[PDB]
Symmetry: D3
Subunit: 144 residues, 6 copies
């Protein structure tokens, strides 16, 4: 298809999504990078937003939990160019009822070409990247 | 889980979604019920919005095509109580790349208990139902209570 | 493909299918519409048949539970034109082992164009529809013509 | 769960199911074993039944094509103990619209413990087995 | 797709894989055919293999547990022609997190045309087959031709 | 789940995988970072690898084509700690027959905690990261402990 350009603002809109058994893994990650994260706009599904808020004092825009539609809310925001980075620690060792939503969200993040991390190693590599705090240009499908 | 109720307004917010091979099928349905549909609010993914306004003169809230995120936009609206009826003519005879999105949307419509039709027979039965133009209450998950 | 029509009889053959966590949901629906359901022919998978006859006194054609093949038995009947309405309250919040069977049954109900409800709101709209007790024709794939 | 017993008759009810690109592979297999197959009861989905009938002169009970419900018809027969052997040459190199039906049929054949072959090698091993023409006892779930 | 042939050796490389609710069912089958199985080359996923080895004293080359990658290790071996028979008792009555791995493994066993059994009835029919202990030729995709046409 | 650590070497073992409609997109990315990529150890599935090698003269250890088993071969290597980075440009706009293999590979890369990129933006962020050429410790499931508790 035809590609065009979109610029990720220097101050990114980051979505943090985790499955129950990966909540701690994500909490730990957020705490460890709080200083950098404190400079961006945060979104989270379910109670995770509350957990982060209470633990770090950082403001987090909350969305519905995954099973209730939160993944599709984030997917919608991504398709509209309102989310620039997705940190999605889904559980590869547990069968979840909303698996279609999980796969759909990952499909959309791939299509819209935004930085996506599904594990700590990838998340660390991305957040430590030089241009994480810079305005970055990415190729995206030209919807028109 | 905890349940509560919500009112579907007399004037319904209807999402019309169709796969390429089911486009004519959806249009024929809209055209067969134009008079009744004129009293409601329409939403449509992809090119369907324009086809409808061009063919019927009705205004439609357009959203992205399915493969590009339209299904999730509709699903997000359903979860927020902004869509009351879903007419989703998905293709049962063709493999689609965004199948996960299709299944996710249908999963959400089931969870949030809104009228959903995936074929013409179901759509006709729903639209001919007496309370389609009335305000009706439905039982839905009580997310707020559940959260706390 | 080639299409043709088939008549849904005034007296409908209704399949009632529910997942464990949706059993009470299905029963409540049957009990809320007992008077109307008494005029039709009921089929049910698993233990639902007995629960219905015990609670309402209505006779039900019992089939195997979903995991054991009940979904395919119903799907086979739909494809043969022996089931006219499908009330399938599947669980959108629990992963089931026979998910393929669930998706296959819903795929077939869509293909054969019969009224299908996956939640209470849709089921209520369908059963309250004027022609639920009337003979109605539906457009279906013309397999015979297609074959030749 | 509780298992019980069922006896596969010496004369088996065999279902032959193939995807478009595996039609020839199955035709060839049926021809090569016609003498043995001629002793059993055959079922097939779609036009394959007609193809076999016209090519071998053998009688084949036809079912609907896969996309139209044929796989579920066969699945139903299996769950009712009316099919004893399933020869299902599905296509592992092509995405099919009725994939759920394909997986459901294979799931049922596994649950009901009947001999199932999805490729020629397995089919040959099964048909050349000594007890293929004998009444055989198999463990099955005790539905009651 | 062009086909060529490959020869399964007399002593087969057998992969034994079972889901938790099917492990006892697999163990019983193994015990029942232990004398014959001892003649062949055995491989098994993490847990399954260790239980077999422990109970029968048989040599079983163990791979990682299915969820941790064992199914893909077995899949890779099948594609490389190093596994000749697959005994995979997967659970049809329980949803597993590594379902994609399960389907991928079965897809590959189908593609590479090796004898595959997913239940006891099929396993018994295969192991009782005359040529189970013989070298036997099977038709397999001709990869060389397949790649060339792709390039 | 118990976690331990593993160290990714300075010169990484990189798997490059692309679906047909994404191959040009992957090739362009490779060409753009060729000088750096030449320093690392490269692996690729059937077709992808050969096209890269042919166009850039770079050494690429080729595996089988994805549909023929290459994805599982890559999955097996990740689980054995032999692949450190996965660049997988799968096609989100086309249905593929080996979808289970695709999902299984991504599931394993997630489980084993290695850097994974499924689009250009993520790939660029990763390769431009400071520690891409450094030895870096990652947390991984402690398999030994995981197995023991299963037995």
């Amino acid at each position: 298809m035809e590609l065009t350009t979109r610029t990720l603002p220097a101050r990114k809109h980051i979505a943090l999504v985790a499955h129950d058994h990966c909540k701690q893994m994500l909490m730990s990650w957020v705490e460890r990078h709080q200083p950098l994260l404190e400079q961006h706009v945060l979104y989270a599904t379910g109670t995770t937003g509350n957990l982060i808020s209470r633990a770090t004092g950082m403001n987090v825009n909350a969305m519905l939990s995954g099973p209730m539609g939160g993944d599709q809310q984030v997917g919608a925001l991504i398709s509209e160019g309102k989310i620039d980075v997705l940190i999605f620690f889904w559980d590869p060792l547990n069968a979840v009822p909303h698996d279609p939503d999980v796969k759909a969200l990952l499909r959309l993040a791939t299509v819209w070409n935004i930085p996506v991390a599904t594990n700590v190693a990838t998340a660390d590599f991305i957040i430590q990247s030089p241009h994480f705090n810079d305005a970055v240009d990415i190729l995206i499908p030209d919807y028109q």
